[PDB]
Amino acid sequence: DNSYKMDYPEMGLCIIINNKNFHKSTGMTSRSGTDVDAANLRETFRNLKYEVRNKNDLTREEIVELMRDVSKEDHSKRSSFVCVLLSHGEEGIIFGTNGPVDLKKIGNFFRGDRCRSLTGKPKLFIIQACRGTELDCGIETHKIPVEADFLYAYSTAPGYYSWRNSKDGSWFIQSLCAMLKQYADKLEFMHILTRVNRKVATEFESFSFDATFHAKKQIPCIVSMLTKELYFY
């Protein structure tokens, strides 16, 4: 009763939405390095035995339709559900290629009363996206709730930019995949994500020719409404 049942026939789906190029209606810069993230995540979750589905450059309409359709699948034989969102964002918002959609709208499809074959199962949302435009300068050293069993693993603190490297991928996804590869057979998920927080916080610092964007830091933000411990083994 302390840990989620993870020995269903299937670990579950891993949906990866990878938005790199955006319409001129929004403008918004192409997200160089995000293909590196998407590939890293595909391989990482393949090795965790998830059924990975990669999707590229979805409009906000397409994102909502995809989430709706997936929430209407029969997940009875699956232990869990994972959704990874790679895009531009603002607080509470992820961008389709043609504009913003509320994260709440995406999550709502998987509510305990709306996706019954996932009721009582962990629903993990992993979000690499800005959550605002602040920069961190750093410092020298018989019923269950319908909102239960969600985890939102954010790349960055609320209100803040999130950092992506054009060559290596985003700081958060780099670190997440590295910690999952090293510890998924040894540590509970919250402890893995805590290692990810440390890695991002300690091993990364921005380098920029623009002083305004130089020497900046990042701390990811784990938001858990899980009711049990989650082990991938």
Positions marked catalytic:
88, 130
Q: What secondary structure letter does DSSP report for 48?
A: T
- Distance CA(174)–CA(86), nearest Å, equals 13
The position carrying tokens 């969600």 is 150
Strand 89-90 to strand 93-96: parallel, antiparallel, or no bridges (unpaired)?
A: antiparallel
Question: Using the rule CB under 8 A, which residue among 27, 143, 167, 210 binds a copy of itself?
Answer: 143
- Distance CA(91)–CA(130), nearest Å, equals 7
Q: Which does 225 bind (CB under 5 to 8 A by kind): a copy of itself, other proteins, none?
A: a copy of itself
Question: Using the rule CB under 8 A, which residue among 112, 127, 129, 180 binds a copy of itself?
Answer: 112
Q: Confirm or reject binding of residue 31 to other proteins (CB under 8 A).
A: yes
Question: Using the rule CB under 8 A, which residue among 26, 108, 119, 165 binds a copy of itself?
Answer: 119
Alpha carbon separation from 162 to 9, 16, 90, 183, 221 (Å, rounded): 36, 18, 10, 24, 11
The position carrying tokens 């790679």 is 86
Question: Using the rule CB under 8 A, which residue among 32, 68, 102, 215 binds a copy of itself?
Answer: 215
Q: Which does 213 bind (CB under 5 to 8 A by kind): a copy of itself, other proteins, none?
A: other proteins
Residues ending a continuous segment of the chain before a break (C–N > 2.5 Å):
141
Q: Confirm or reject binding of residue 165 to other proteins (CB under 8 A).
A: yes
Q: Amino acid letter at 176?
A: L
Q: Any idea what the Cα angle at residue 226 is, between residues 199 and 109, rounded to 5°? A: 105
Nearer to a copy of itself, 184 or 201 (CB): 201
- Binding-site residue total for other proteins (CB under 8 A)? 31
Closest CA to 133 of 110, 177, 163: 163
Q: Confirm or reject binding of residue 45 to other proteins (CB under 8 A).
A: no
Q: Confirm or reject binding of residue 194 to a copy of itself (CB under 8 A).
A: yes
Q: Confirm or reject binding of residue 185 to a copy of itself (CB under 8 A).
A: no
Q: Minimum distance between the CB of residue 29 and a copy of itself, rounded to whole angstroms? A: 24
Chain residues that interact with a copy of itself, rule: CB under 8 A: 1-2, 112-113, 116, 119-120, 136-148, 157, 160, 188, 190-191, 193-195, 197-198, 201-202, 205, 215, 217-229
